[PDB]
Structures are given as C-alpha cells and as structure tokens.
Write a protein that binds this ligand. Structure first.
Ligand SMILES: Nc1ncnc2c1ncn2[C@@H]1O[C@H](CO)[C@@H](O)[C@H]1O
Ligand SMILES: Nc1ncnc2c1ncn2[C@@H]1O[C@H](CO)[C@@H](O)[C@H]1O
Ligand SMILES: Nc1ncnc2c1ncn2[C@@H]1O[C@H](CO)[C@@H](O)[C@H]1O
Ligand SMILES: Nc1ncnc2c1ncn2[C@@H]1O[C@H](CO)[C@@H](O)[C@H]1O
Ligand SMILES: Nc1ncnc2c1ncn2[C@@H]1O[C@H](CO)[C@@H](O)[C@H]1O
Ligand SMILES: Nc1ncnc2c1ncn2[C@@H]1O[C@H](CO)[C@@H](O)[C@H]1O
Lengths: 233, 233, 233, 233, 233, 233
C-alpha cells in the first residue's frame, strides 16, 4: 500500500497497534517467535511472528488521528486485517485513575473534526467491539492488573493552551487522554472489523506524575500479554 | 421536585426508567410487591416496591432527551438515586438486528445539541457504567435472550425527512434508534452515578416490521427481569 | 398513528396542545361539551368535544421538542389537523415580565439542533401564523389579560448548569423560556398549516417566584378561553 | 459618529432606513418638509424633515448585515434613535407572494454568522417590535395594499451558487429574501428600542420577474406612507 | 448588471475597489485622464479613465462582505474584469503595526459564514494572487512606504461587544481589521481572476488613534499609485 | 522535551521539517557536514550539522496536524527554534499543477478542527512568513525550478470517502493536498517565529500519477537546496 511495503499475505489478520514503531520492535522481539519485519517505510516498523503458536502482527501507527487513520485504512483495505488492538499509553485526567492502571476504552470523545465531516450535525460515538473488550477485560482481570473500562478523550492537541475542557470531561467520567482511539474505532466499524484500545496510564495530566518505559515495563508487558491473548482467541 | 411529588425517601436508590408511564405501571404490577405510587404529576407515573425482597422503583420518563433529562436530574439531585436503568424500545437500523433482540447500549450517537453546548468543539461520547453493563449482559445471556451490546442513535426526531444519515450510521455499526440514552448516560456521568439502557427491538426502520406490546411481551418481560436482576446486585 | 390510537375523523381540525396530558383532561372537562377521549396511548390523553357549538380537540404533547414533534407530525399528517394552538406555561427571564402574564410567541429562539440539521449553515426563525396571532391578541386584549407578544426561548434543557446565556437572551428581549414552540412553529410551516403558542408565565427564573396550578387557575382559564376563541374563528 | 457627520440632535428619534441612499433622498424630497441633509459621509445620505408636522429622519444603510449594523449601532448609541423602520425591497421565494406585495417581517432567518457568534450553540430568532408591526399592518390594510406578515431570509449572498436552500426555506413558509433585517431587529432588541422592516416585493427569484423603481413607484410610495404613519404614532 | 448601469465594454479589465464611492471619485479625479462615470446606481460611483496611458477603472464597493460580493460578482461575471485591487483602510490590532503603514493582505481570517456555507466542515483560507502581490510589494518598497505583508481579519461586525477574539488574533500575527478581503479573494479564486487588497492603516483599535482622510492623504495617494502601478503591469 | 531527547543547545535555530524521519536522515547525510543525531525517540530522527558553514537542523515530524504540532511546540518552546521550514510532498488537485512542481504555501485551508477550537466562530487563515517565502521563491526561481506560490489543503484524512470537496477546493484555486501546514503556520504565528512550507508535488490525486523518491530525487534535492538557502539567510 502507499505507506506499507509488505506483500499481500505478509501481515496477519490479528494485529497490535502501538503508536511508537520502536515499541512495535520491542513487542516483536520480546513476545514473538519466527519474526520478520515487513515494513520500514517512514521508519514505521511492522512485524509478523508467532505467539503461543498463532500468527500475529505488530505495526506502529504514529501519533494522532490522521496518522493512525492512514495505517488502519491500509491494513484493513489492502491487507485484510480483521482484529486490531491498539496498545498504547495515556494520561490520566481523574485523581482516581492511577499511573500503571490499564484502561480499556469502551468509547472515545474527541476534539477531532473527522466524524463531524462524515456525519454533519451528529455526535458519532465510536464503540469498541464488545467481544474483544470482554476477552481483554477477562484476561486482564485474571492477570492481576488494575483494569478500568470506560471513556477516553482522543485529542488532536497534546499541548493545549487551556486544560479547562479536559478537566470538565474528567468531571463527566472521562478517564484519560490519548490521540488515536476515535479513528481506530470509527474505521473498524466502517469496514465491519473488530477493534479495541488497551492503554497503560503513563502520566497524570494535572499532578505532573510521569514515567519512563523502564518504570512501567512490567505493567506494560502484562498489558501486551492480555492484548495478544485476546487477539489469539 | 418540580415534576415529581414524592417525599424524600419514597424513591429507591435503584430505578428502572421506561419511556411510557403505563409501562411503569405494568412493571410495578407485574414484578413488584408492596407497591406504592409516589407520583402522578403530568401523568408520569412512578412506583416503589420490592423485587426478590429488595426495594426498587420505576419511573416513566416520557420521550426525548429533554423529557428524560428533567426526570433524571430530579431523581439524582433531589432523590439520591444511584443506579438508573432505562428499559425501553428501539428501532433496528441493520438487517442483522432482529425484532425481539435485546440491545444493551455501550454508548450512543446523537443529533441532539445537548453535549455540543456543554463541550463546545468536542464530540462527547456518553458511556454506560461497565459494571452494570456486565451484570445485565451476564444475566441476559443466562436468561436465554439474544443480547447485542453496541452503539445506538439517540434521535431528537422520530419523523425524519430523509433517513440517509440513519442508514449511514448503520453502515458504521450503529444498531438501533431510540430517543433517550445520550441524556441518561451523560447526566449519570456528570453526577457520578451508574446508568445503563437495556432496549427491546420493537420495529425495524427500513423493512417496516412492527410489533404491539402483546406481540413482544414475553421478550419484554424477560428483559425487565434482567434489568431488575442487575439493579438488585 | 404510531402514538395516537384515534380513528380517522375523531380528531377535530382545530386543536389545543397543552404539554401536560392532565391539563388536556382539565380543559376538556371544564370547557367542552359532548366530550370523548380518543387517546390514552402512553397516557398522553386526547379529547374531542364542542365549545360554543364548534368541534375542537385537546391533546397533550409531553415536554420538549422531540415529544411535541412526534404528536404534531401525527396530528398534521395522519389526522388532517389545520389549526394548532399550544397552551402552556413558561418561565420569565426579564424582570418586566410578570407571573400570570400571557405571552403570545411571535417566534422562538432555541438551543435545539433540530433546524440546524434541516438548514445547515442557517439560523431558521420559526414564525407564528399571523392571522391566529392577531385573533388571540385581540381576544386577550378584550378579555382584560396582560398580554405580551414577543420572542421566547425553546430550551432542550430545563436544568442548565449556567444560566448566563439565558440572561443574555433576556438582554436581547427574549421574554420567557419554554420547551416546545420551535417545533410546533417549524412543523406547521413545513406542512402549510396554522400554529400559535399562548403561554401563561408560571415562574420567574431568576427571582425564584413559582406558582401552583390553583394559584394561576383564573388566569389560565381566561387564557384557555382566548385560545379556544381564536380556534373557533 | 465614525460614519455619520451629524451633530447631536440633528437626527430625529424616528427614522426610516432604506438600503439605497438615493432612495433616502427621494423619500425626503417627496414626503418631507423643512428638510436638511445631515450626512454625506461615504455618500450615505441622511436627512431630517417633517411629515404631517412631526420630525422624522431617513438614512441610507447600504446593503448587507455588516453595513446596516454600522449605521444602526451609530444611530442608536450616538444619536439616541428610538424607532427604526427599514423600508426596502425583497425578492419573493414563494409563488403565492407577488411582485408589489408589501411584506412586514415578523422575524428573519439568516445565513449570517452574526448571531451564532453572540449566542454560541443557539438559534437566535430576531423579532419585530409588535406595537410597530401592528401599527404598520393596520395602516397598510387601511391604505388598500396587499400586506403579508411573516418570515423573511436575511441573506449574506445575493449571488448564491445553488438556490436549493432558499427553495427549501420557501417550503417552510419564508416569504422573500433581503439582506438587512436580522441585523436591524437584533440590534434594536439589544438596545431596547423599536424596529420593523416593511418591504416591497420587487422581483421573484425563481420566475425571473423584475421591476424598475418607476414600475413599482405607486406601491412604493404607499408603503413609505404607512412606514411614516406608523413612525409618527 | 443588477447594481451597475454600465454598458458592456465600459469597465476596464483592471479595476481598483475602494469601499467608499467618494474615494472612487477622488481617485478618478486625482489620478486618471479621459474619465467617464459609468455608474451611479445606489450612489455607488464607478469610473473609467487612463493612467500613464493605460485604461483602468475604479468602483466603490460599500462596506462588508455582502456588499463587496455583489459588486465583485457583477464585475467578473457581467463585465469581464480580470484584475481587481481593493484599496482601502484598516484598523491595526498589533502595537507594532502603525497608522499610515500599508498592509498587503496575503490572506484573511473572518467571522463571516460565507465560506463555511460553501465548504461545510472546512476552514477556507482565501489567498491573494501572488504575482499581483509581488508587483505591489516591489512597487511599494521602491516608493518608500512602510509595507507589511501578512494576515488580516475580515470582520462582519465593526462594533463588537468584546474585542477579546480580535486581541487573540493579534497574538497570532493578524495585522489589522477590515471588512471586505475574504470576499474579494474567494470570488476571484472561484472565477480564476486576480485579486489583491492594499490597505492603509487609518486607526489603531486598542490605542484609539484615528485619522481623517486629509491626515493620511500623502500616504494614501502613494498607496493608490502602487495599486495602479501593479494594475497596469 | 517529552518527544525529543536532545540537550539544550543541540538543535539549531533554523530547522527543516520533513514528514518522514528517513528523509531527515537523507537530508543530513546528503547536504550537511559535522552531523550529529540528537534524537531517536519514537524513531523520529533529528540531526544537526552545517551547510555552507552555517549550523542547521533537520527533524522528522510524522504525518498529520497532531503529530507535527507536538514536534513544533517542543522545538519552539523547549529548544528556541526561530525559523522552521517544512520540506515535504503533496498531491496536486488541479490539472495545471504538475508532478515535480515545487509549491510554496502562502496559506492553507483545512478540515482540521484545531483552529475552530482556538477561535470559535472564526475561520483562521494561517499565513507563511513573507520574508522566508520571498527568499525561497527567489532562490527557487534562480535554481530553475517550476515554483508555484499559493494555497494548499491541510487534510486530516488521507483516504477520504468522497473527493467532492477536494475537487471544489481545486475549483477555488487550491493547488495541492498535504497534512501539516496549517499546524506549522498557526503555531509559528502564535509564538512569533518564522515558518514556511516548501513542497514537491509527488502525485496527482485525480489522474493517479505517482512517483517514487528516486523518480523525483533531482527535483527534491534542488528543493532542499532552496529551503536550506532560505534558512541560512
Ligand atoms: N497526556 C497525554 N496527552 C495526549 N496523548 C498522550 C498522553 N499521554 C500519552 N499519550 C499518548 O502518547 C502519544 C503522545 O505522547 C500519543 O500517541 C497518545 O496516544
Ligand atoms: N424507530 C424508532 N425511532 C425512534 N425512537 C424509537 C423507535 N422505536 C422505538 N423508539 C422509542 O420509542 C419512543 C418513540 O416511539 C422513544 O421513547 C424511543 O426511545
Ligand atoms: N422555567 C422553565 N423552563 C423551561 N420550561 C418551562 C419553564 N417553566 C415552564 N416551562 C414549561 O413547562 C415544562 C417544563 O416544566 C415544559 O413543557 C415548558 O414548556
Ligand atoms: N432577490 C434578492 N436577493 C437579495 N436581496 C434583495 C433581493 N431583492 C431585493 N433585495 C434587497 O436589495 C438589495 C440587494 O439588491 C439588498 O439591500 C436587499 O435587501
Ligand atoms: N477598525 C476597523 N474595523 C473594521 N473595519 C475597518 C476599520 N478601520 C477601517 N475599516 C474599513 O473601513 C470600513 C469601516 O469603517 C470598512 O470598509 C473596513 O474595511
Ligand atoms: N495526496 C496526498 N494527500 C495527503 N497528503 C499527501 C498527499 N501526497 C503527499 N502527502 C504528504 O505525504 C504524507 C501522506 O502520505 C503527509 O505527510 C502529506 O503531507
């Protein structure tokens, strides 16, 4: 496809979608066997391998609705991908959401215009695939993680001049901010395929708490395991 | 409160919210014991009784976002209600959704302006309480119903001049149309309480299939049972 | 029709539209002769009788744009209704508007999205039928009421978190808040029929003054008389 | 003021507002006595004189919401004007509205953003002063004119690429198109003063019928007479 | 055309567009030879003459997007005009922009709805013709003027209740406020012809500095010279 | 900063901003001397070196408004960058724009919501720094390139379901589509620094013409040279 140099058949039907291509590399090297790298266009690494005997892929998406939309469109339309699980990070809005919690997004709010252009006059609420959601929830519960299922904000702007509206969204139960889920869920629904976002809380937006990858590595690894485990079902 | 004549303490902390006040009466008479009627203002019947030994209420909401918003605000703010389950009907958009299916709304799309006014420039995605959702899903699965968990449209207009956008929403996975869920979910989130909508598909919007209450009574009764059963947990 | 169980011909061509179905009952019992009740679906009472020898009906609408839109569509399209007069209550915004004043709405502002969806990019100003307006104005003037003709707000939200915008509308001459007129006027114009809203001020939104039905009964009765009197012309 | 060179007191409290400054000149020369010209800034002629013994003024506004807004703000805020009657032309949308009809605008629709900026999320419906409206209606009825009271469109664009939305507005009862009324009515309401628009239909937008000033001069003169006659009351 | 009484061929292919028709007269009398006046409809003076031997015209536009849009549509579509240079005034927002500076607008921001109606969901950025822009810039630089090339605001409202957003636009580099450029640039682009706006700063919006025409006459004359000089190339 | 691991002082005040980090590497290796790599976070390569003796940097941005906004905010606010030139590719809309043309964006249209959120009710037109624009234009003209200066579309969606609006923008003179310029120009203006986008046309959106990097390498190299050459001035 335009942004992926893989041949037909090189990408598995189940795929994990980290934002960071170097996390795709980490995931492939850490969890998968019989790995190949099928893409390096724009440095946006993608790999296919095997996990507990089942083929699965992992593809960086970049940051933001427009970037992930490019990759998700191509994966679905050109490579026949059927199950897409974003595995990423997010920033907690609410005090009761803690760093290292795992959030499974039921739906996402957004300040993107992408859906207003498609459905003029409507608020489109992008929805996770429930069967994937339940599988991931059950796996995370069994794994011993703190798992929160709820609403997130998909933001276009990481650096917002005022966080007043983000605070207000927190007062309406929104758990955390990230930059991709609306697009993944909307496009998966458009094409009749299955999507989910499983997120590690890496920072808290108002307290200023932050982590390095190493400082959340054990939680992150466990989260990747549940995302894979849902995928292989 | 302005629209409910009940005394403090007369309304239980768990409440079912049919749109039709005569369905509130049917639910109270059919399922509850030790019933009183606490409201007849505007004919919008409300009752409190006991189900399997646990106090529970049932309150008509009327049709549309503005009507249900009035009742939900008053129930939460004046009567201390904590768990609110809308029990209603909806019209299927998709061919694969069948009359007599039970839909549990994860989230809702809308053509209402209510949330655009609150969050200018954002799409707010109203979310069910996951713990109530899971309880209802598990109960419905055990009860032997066809249960679908997904997205609905909360419409302001029942009689729409063109159904083009409703069809398009169906192509993006939206299951059915109804007229209340966005408001219930948004206000419950605002006030930190728990909400869910459990819906019976009573009509199919493009095929023209329709039912009378009697023609869906067994399914409807089973749906009320799961809504109660979730409530009493 | 879907929400009205009347046979063809049972509803008169002129109809009064209170929001409260119990007010429809009061109006029929108090003013009309040879009364029948043609609807009890959803408790939304409707009656037909005679006033000064002329057939006229009265139909509850419920609260909010979506509810009244359902009933008005059905009355016009399925029952051939030609003259529709909402008779309701409203909350004064301005200090110079007093409780027990009668407001005849020339037009209505709104926070509903209903007309933005129909006329994207435009502000649609819904207009009363002038000939009905003049008849009601002349009748109210003769009856000795305080009658104000002007602008109202049709609100989707009764419980608004901030009343700043309602205050601002008052500073631009808007007289009072209610929850139905935009829909009635827009749909009547769509179908080429005649509509008017005649409202009793029952509360003042910033002073906190409020009334019971009994406390405004004489004014309300006189208002119903002028609404009927316009109708029978 | 910035756009009017008159001294304080030179402009009367009642004023007619044609769009064309040369029509202001025609009105002053044809109907008024003891006339002075108080403004020629930008060629936007303004005059004060006497009609049936009462002082009255006439001020060109130019075309469009932004132009009339400048003049109306200055007249109200700097010159203390209290009664403002636009006297202009319009293009009929509906077949049943005829060239040479006089339309008295109750309210106006618009494609301008002026009120959306002031009342974000709301449709503001600008309203005529009813007492001026009634006076003009009664005077026009007595004068023997065809007078229509209703809704108009205040357009920003005279040359619209598609007239689809204008046709649709006609199907919702909107009588004619012009380019000033929303602004006049909104600003008069803002400042607590009295406004009305009295319009001659000079063209029909879909049939292509058009007139010269001479071809509508008798109707136009009679319309000016009723506008003055209302003003002097 | 509807608003211009000129015969075909009486208007030159290059035209200057002051907002004030009396400035059109001043420009024609001061700079042009062999002058005729081709329009006095609505007092909106237009002239054709010769400058350094080349035919050129000058046409008042009035104030605001809707007024200039009328004239620009007619000039382009009915009179075959190819090069259109607005020559006007503006109000500085930024402290670093000085009265008597000449601003050449690269593009324009707006609070008009004109382009949102044409391109729903998009921000359209109207662009100057670069070749005209460069010619005017080079001529102004040679003439010894202070020339600033940048962004302006095309406002619908001269009298804005709050200038907060205008200040904010200044903080994002917007140089000055005026009331026509968006329309000129958008329509010229639509029809494939060449437009530019060359503006004299006549007032500073926050400091209150203001000028009479006489107080900026030398700068204004030099600006007209560069606008002509670009035109005749 | 959060997404760049460079120490203070490691990034030069002038920077080129390709979307593709592998193009940043190509630019550094091909044109610069004394090169270091200061960032590999998320694979988003950044380098500093010397060109004709002057320090300059090159930093990948990723694709889309949200991605470039992250990097531009950090470069300006944390690293003190003053001159930012995006060097990228774009897709021609118009037939008269050819593959291998170089487009210098004066301004950009967008379907992003980023500026509507910042300036509610306004269309913000993001503007290039004119002095950088002129330098690049003069350098490209001297270099013998086909250089077009004009308007572009900054799109959020690469894969748009209908290209109707993109075609319409082409009919209003918009030259090409890309995915970053609105953000770069808006943020540079916000912070008072200098930005420009210099683009190679790599594909034609309606004809289907496309190129590989090798197939446009000579043009691309010349474009990089002019971007550098402007930068070092
Ligand atoms: N506080 C935050 N705000 C926005 N995005 C965040 C935040 N924390 C983590 N992310 C995620 O990391 C990237 C931005 O650093 C995005 O891909 C986004 O999903
Ligand atoms: N097809 C439908 N469209 C809209 N609302 C529906 C439909 N079917 C059932 N409903 C529900 O029933 C009422 C409208 O008849 C509303 O309360 C709504 O939730
Ligand atoms: N203050 C108020 N705000 C909104 N609606 C009101 C108010 N007072 C009376 N109403 C009317 O009564 C109902 C809400 O109580 C609605 O039908 C509405 O028209
Ligand atoms: N068909 C029309 N469309 C828009 N404005 C019109 C029309 N006919 C008359 N007008 C009026 O005349 C001017 C435009 O020619 C405006 O001031 C406007 O109010
Ligand atoms: N401060 C200002 N605000 C708006 N328009 C201005 C200003 N100064 C000059 N103008 C120009 O002059 C007219 C308004 O006085 C308009 O045509 C406009 O372009
Ligand atoms: N046809 C196109 N549509 C959108 N972006 C494009 C196109 N061609 C090149 N681009 C650029 O390349 C990337 C998308 O492939 C974006 O960074 C964008 O700026």
């Amino acid at each position: 496809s335009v942004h992926i140099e893989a041949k037909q058949g090189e990408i598995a039907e189940s795929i994990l979608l980290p934002g960071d291509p170097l996390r795709a590399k980490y995931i492939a090297e850490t969890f998968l066997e019989d790995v190949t790298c099928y893409n390096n266009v724009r440095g946006m690494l993608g790999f296919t391998g095997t996990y507990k005997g089942k083929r699965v892929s992992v593809q960086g998406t970049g940051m933001g609705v427009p970037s992930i939309s490019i990759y998700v469109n191509e994966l679905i339309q050109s490579y026949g991908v059927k199950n897409l699980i974003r595995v990423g990070t997010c920033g907690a809005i609410q005090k009761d959401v803690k760093v290292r919690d795992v959030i499974i997004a039921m739906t996402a709010c957004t300040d993107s215009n992408m859906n207003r252009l498609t459905f003029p006059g409507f608020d489109f609420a992008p929805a996770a695939n429930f069967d994937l959601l339940k599988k991931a929830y059950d796996a995370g519960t069994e794994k011993g993680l703190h798992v929160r299922v709820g609403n997130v904000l998909t933001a276009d702007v990481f650096y917002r001049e005022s966080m007043d509206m983000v605070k207000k969204l927190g007062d309406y139960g929104v758990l955390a901010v990230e930059m991709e889920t609306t697009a993944l869920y909307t496009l998966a629904a458009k094409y009749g395929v299955n999507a989910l976002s499983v997120l590690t809380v890496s920072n808290h937006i108002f307290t200023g708490e932050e982590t390095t990858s190493e400082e959340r590595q054990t939680t992150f690894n466990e989260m990747i395991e549940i995302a894979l485990d849902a995928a292989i079902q």
